[PDB]
Amino acid sequence: RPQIKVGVLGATGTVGQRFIELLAAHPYFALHALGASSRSAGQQYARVVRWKLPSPIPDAVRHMVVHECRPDAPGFAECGVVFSGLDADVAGDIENAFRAADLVVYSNAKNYRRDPLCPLIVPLVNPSHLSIIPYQREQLGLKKGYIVTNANCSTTGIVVPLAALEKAFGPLDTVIVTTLQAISGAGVSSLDIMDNVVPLISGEEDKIEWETNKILGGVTPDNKAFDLHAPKQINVSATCTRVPVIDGHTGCVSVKFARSPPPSVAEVENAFREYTCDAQHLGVPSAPAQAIVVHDAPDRPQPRLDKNLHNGACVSVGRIRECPVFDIKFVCLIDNVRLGAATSSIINAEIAVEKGLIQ
Template sequence: MSQKIPVGILGATGAVGQNYIYLLQNHPWFEVSYIAASPRSAGKSYREVVASKWLLGANIPEGVADLIIEDANDASKALGRCRFVFSALELDSKDEIKALENAYAALGIPVVSNASAHRWSEDVPMLIPEINADHISVIDAQRKTHGWDKGFVAVKPNCSLQSYMTPIWALMQAGYEVKRMFVTTMQAVSGAGYPGVPSLDMIDNVVPYIGGEEEKSEKEPLKILGKVENGKIVNFGGLKVSAHCNRVPVINGHTACISLEFGDKKPSLAEVEKIWREFRALPQELDLPFAPRQPIIVRSEANRPQPRRDRDEDKGMAVSVGRLRECPLFDIRFVGLSHNTVRGAAGGGILNAELLKAKGYLA
């Protein structure tokens, strides 16, 4: 009998749900045992629903292909069939997603979510484990507030933030105050899901608008960098962010161009590079399978990082940085890159679940 933890996937037929299924095959801790999607898919095998729109690799993983899809709107269906769920729900209303994720948690089924519905709930941790692993302590207050015993909700942030927040945090951890950040993102089409952006809008084009993305990019860093006080996450108040977000004709890999202004103490370029190369955040004894061995990979070439060359570094979970140089308006500027459907989506959710298990929240 398998000793792996049985897990469920909500929204299993969508692009993020497929990524979860693909990345979780052969995972040493977790095994997909339950899948759920919209009512129109319920009662059918995963193979039957997804075969014509499978996006990853040659074949659907055999361990999941013949599972019968359940209705994700009925949380009780998951009882006894999985210990927690990954949420990749794609509903029109954030309120509907929030209510549904809460329904699973109320039944004692923890929810590790990719959806944005709970990102601004004060008692829900929005995790990048290398930065704010300590935020999981707010789960205790969350359970108390809702009267939940074993259930809870934890989320991951917007996918594009993964390409630059860890390098910025590394500098802050080294004692350098970051006062202002100007960021321009060039985001891959896979970030729009499937079928995503129409080809005639995307080929030979750049779309300088992604709905809600700039607001997320300017607000979410403040929660990620915040602290837990009295059972709530209090946003960080010492950083101003200005963001431009663009959709570009790249399949996978979000790129960001960042300029930073520091406080009175300013690092040299050599010191910045040293901090990034030496940055390690998660204790080795946790031995999280999806954690990158080197969270920040520094490229010294003048034309790197590039999505096609660098997005898959360290299981697609590392952040690649390059083009570090002085900024004539602020202090320094650089380019960051991460794999948006791995680190920025399903892989990031899996790493969050690994951290929660290691800390005793997924028994």
């Protein structure tokens, strides 16, 4: 009910735009400080942005002035959380500067994802990893500031179903995944992709392979480290492709469980339907009512058909069936528009509010 002033870095970029759209409509986060390039600084948001979203620029921000991306620019020192939609080329130094100036940063860049003090949180899976924040502060000589990184959409679309499986049936041994990723990802030139498939997305396989164990793992009982799902880490092998689709990342997944016997198809269907997470239990405003939708039709999910599901649902799965090689295989879909980078970072921040990590 009392407002919390927030910042958006990279405000003119597409992620920044979405942050702005969602935060204007938010029940307690209040847009207070926008950061963009040196070329845009000093201009009003409305005049410098190339607004690429269906609905129009909100009134609250039309006449807000974009500033340089530093912690001592106008408004930023009063922000209780600063959201970052910056590209990795510039995000590292800047996000570090905001944190060094004792501000709280929710990032979407790669720069801090593997940092051993910085949580990498998929909000529908591992918000508990906020427990390491005090130790991050202490180690930097900070009282208030820290960094949390949000995961990318293809990783999210995979680990959410995996988390539901681990919660219901215990740890996973082995995971194989092939992705078919839409172009909203980011960009991709039409020449590269039309009437084609590009079987490489650089860095993407390695992200899924490494990050899955961080995200599905825990924090050590002392709250000073990530266990990365040790001692027995999940074996993950990915192949990531790009397809000529605007929105919707599809994943084809095979799973082997550590425990025997493996569940039946029906038990796996139920595990997905029933899955509920901390963020829903805390009742944060941006959490969906339904975490995973199970499709019964044999040819679903499909990215173009199964966007904007009911109950705010953002991940879905289908074609759940036996795998002659492992235990179970299936197809999953993430609506990377609804559960994009901005939405994930916001839900993460809402949870930090509930835990008293933000004022």
